């Protein structure tokens, strides 16, 4: 019966809440209250990559931390050289509606995807000299919101049909499908060891998914609205989510509960992108009040504002070597702050 | 200078890439993009058929104008999480079946969707080419089934001539930003070969209004 099962369902939820409350004895602020604050941090626009003629919707830094790709609504997938300004590749998309992009760890492949419900894998290193389509992954019944490359043959895609899927590029089929979400999955981030990943969805809950076992492992609630962004801590034992209620939250993998609440009274907009620093001290969040923000990830204080954009910030990314942070806004431009 | 041969050739390649990107953007700037947002398959397929997965795209040229219709209804997701991708569309071609007033009612849900689209933050100044599609079946069924089934407050007679006017005015009622948006209602027939003509007329009027607004005349 529905109520008969709901009885022990709510009993188990209460037991989980009681265990989470009993595992807490002190907040993160109470622990790291005696640490020297990071102080005010200044950021200057070192480079300004221009050339897009529409809204920029995603961006991913390469492993070498010099190449970066950007996806925009005009149908272009520009690959930038970030140390200089000049471009490398200009890939005309089949469908102009793209909301996510990715860069392979080996640098040979770049992904895309959007309202066409199809993830496209582009082979950059071709003998023929032009960027082709290596595979066109179909099988999602909703818009793709975030795709991340596991390796050169596996990609984890998160779609708007409340499902995340693990693919195989050569075969083209879904190796594993991660069910359990009730709202539209909006963002994705893999672990440093690429054996776990977390996905945030519109039902204000982020779940830890085992990419090898194939089922959800933990459930993290706490947000009051849609989770537009998510990112793992560099240690892999934590991750930070940015929701639509002007609040970034830090979750713990082993404590399995709240750690921090990075919210300010002067912001009522919605976080669109979240990324961490190399040492995990500076949590960068791209907000909807036209500028990015910097948060001390151990305290709750601010550190600086990356105010250099005309339209809102949609994508954020800190390089693998930790040198710079790039914010790509909705107007036309990506700015490489450092 | 202080650039080697490879950096100079890379700069030349990026210059050429930006040149073709600018050319493609200039080509796509003159091309009209229309959002076809119907309700419950109330004439989407018929409207697409009489002229010219995820997003269905249809492009057609009609007497020195390139149009682009984005059929959306095959999404079944949260509309507010991707409806901001359609900023800057020239018009929002709606589609409403008049015969669905006696089918909780389909016309009431059509009104709800029209209110949700008119009172939308992103579409605060985009005109709506409303298309009352099924008028023949409405004309045949209006003699037997009265409009009081759908509208208990109706005071008009049974004839289609004023019933269609009541439907049109009720559909224009839910508009709130009347100073920016203009709803170009039209009635579609089976033999109506001028639906694309009315789309062209409404799009030219929208373009003229946009040019007047940019020039300061409006």
């Amino acid at each position, epitope marked *: 019966e529905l109520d008969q099962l709901r009885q022990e369902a709510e009993q188990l939820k209460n037991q989980i809440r009681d265990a989470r409350k009993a595992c807490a004895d002190a907040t993160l602020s109470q622990i790291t209250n005696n640490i020297d604050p990071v102080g005010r941090i200044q950021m200057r626009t070192r480079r300004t990559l221009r050339g897009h003629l529409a809204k920029i919707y995603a961006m991913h830094w390469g492993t070498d931390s010099r190449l970066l790709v950007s996806a925009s609504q005009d149908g272009k997938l520009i690959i930038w050289d970030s140390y200089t300004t000049n471009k490398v590749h200009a890939i005309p998309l089949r469908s102009s509606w793209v909301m996510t992009c990715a860069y392979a760890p080996s640098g040979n492949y770049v992904a895309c995807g959007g309202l066409d419900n199809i993830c496209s894998i582009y082979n950059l290193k071709t003998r023929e000299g032009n960027v082709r389509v290596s595979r066109e992954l179909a099988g999602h019944t909703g818009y793709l919101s975030c795709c991340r490359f596991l390796d050169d043959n596996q990609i984890v895609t998160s779609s708007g049909d409340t499902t995340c899927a693990l693919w195989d590029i050569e075969t083209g089929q879904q190796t594993t499908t991660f069910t359990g979400h009730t709202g539209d999955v909006m963002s994705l981030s893999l672990a440093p060891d690429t054996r776990l990943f977390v996905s945030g969805a519109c039902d204000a809950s982020a779940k830890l998914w085992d990419v090898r076992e194939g089922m959800c492992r933990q459930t993290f609630t706490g947000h009051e609205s849609d989770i537009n962004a998510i990112c793992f801590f560099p240690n892999g034992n934590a991750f930070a989510t940015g929701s639509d209620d002007a609040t970034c939250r830090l979750f713990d993998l082993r404590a399995d509960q709240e750690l921090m609440t990075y919210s300010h009274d002067n912001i009522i907009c919605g976080i669109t992108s979240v990324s961490f620093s190399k040492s995990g001290r500076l949590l960068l969040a791209g907000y909807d009040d036209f500028n990015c923000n910097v948060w001390d990830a151990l305290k709750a204080d601010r550190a600086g504002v990356l105010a250099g954009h005309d339209n809102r910030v949609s994508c954020l990314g800190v390089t693998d070597d930790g040198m710079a942070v790039a914010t790509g806004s909705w107007d036309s431009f990506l700015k490489i702050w450092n | 200078c202080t650039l080697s041969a490879e950096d100079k050739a890379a700069v030349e*390649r990026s210059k050429m890439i930006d040149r073709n990107l600018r050319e493609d953007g200039e080509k796509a700037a003159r091309e009209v993009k229309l959002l076809l947002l119907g309700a419950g398959e109330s004439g989407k397929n018929t409207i697409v058929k009489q002229m010219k997965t995820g997003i269905v795209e249809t492009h057609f040229t009609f007497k020195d104008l390139h149009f682009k219709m984005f059929d959306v209804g095959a999404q079944r997701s949260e509309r507010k999480k991707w409806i901001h991708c359609f900023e800057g569309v020239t018009a929002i071609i709606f589609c409403v079946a008049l015969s669905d007033y006696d089918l909780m009612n389909r016309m009431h849900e059509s009104m709800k969707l029209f209110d949700s689209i008119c009172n939308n933050k992103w579409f605060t100044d985009t005109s709506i080419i409303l298309f009352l599609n099924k008028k023949d079946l409405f004309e045949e069924k209006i003699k037997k089934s009265p409009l009081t089934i759908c509208y208990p407050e109706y005071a008009g007679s049974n004839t289609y001539e004023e019933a269609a006017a009541y439907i049109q005015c009720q559909f224009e009622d839910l508009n709130k930003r009347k100073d920016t948006k203009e709803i170009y209602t039209h009635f579609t027939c089976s033999t109506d070969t001028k639906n694309v003509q009315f789309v062209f007329d409404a799009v030219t009027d929208v373009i003229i209004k946009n040019n007047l607004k940019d020039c300061g005349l409006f």
Partner: single-chain antibody
Amino acid sequence: VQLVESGGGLVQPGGSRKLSCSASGFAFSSFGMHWVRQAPEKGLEWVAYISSGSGTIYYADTVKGRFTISRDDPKNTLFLQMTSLRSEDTAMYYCVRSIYYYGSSPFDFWGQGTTLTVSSSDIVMTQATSSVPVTPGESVSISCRSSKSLLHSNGNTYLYWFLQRPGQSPQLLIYRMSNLASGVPDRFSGSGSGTAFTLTISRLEAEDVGVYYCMQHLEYPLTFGAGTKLEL
């Protein structure tokens, strides 16, 4: 990919001949193309270069003004209209594709080349060895010394290695002195810094028998090296 060559033959001194290099298979419009001559008894030598989209165009000091080079992206053909022939132009002309972006491999594929028989501040690179007898399975080191250090302020030495098996066109082995070209075995390994460069072969087989050349790529008057022929 393919680059089939048409032209050559007996040309009188002071005449004119027109060499057609018709690409087939790859994106010819995105590829800067070169020409590389080779005398019947000497090493390789540079000729000219057109950037992508017929932009910048350079020439060697010897062939400046006499040679004109053009491309036709419609037909995927690229030409070399050369004037004022003499006995010094008796060579075999390879057209070499080269695409320049960050991380690319210029000079990766070489055309077949047509021989041309005529009736009767450059960074010099020195390879003192000209013939190294060796047995298969023995590690071989081939040294290349320049006159000016190729290490630009960016941090990459623009030195290139090539291998010319007897009877076929050269192929890129090492690009930028420390990067393996795609399609070659992993035994090859180039190294060095400044003006002294060496290439270390781990294991040798029967297909490694061939001449080994050098390219500088700092400024566009590129100078080849006296090829150190490898043989058993």
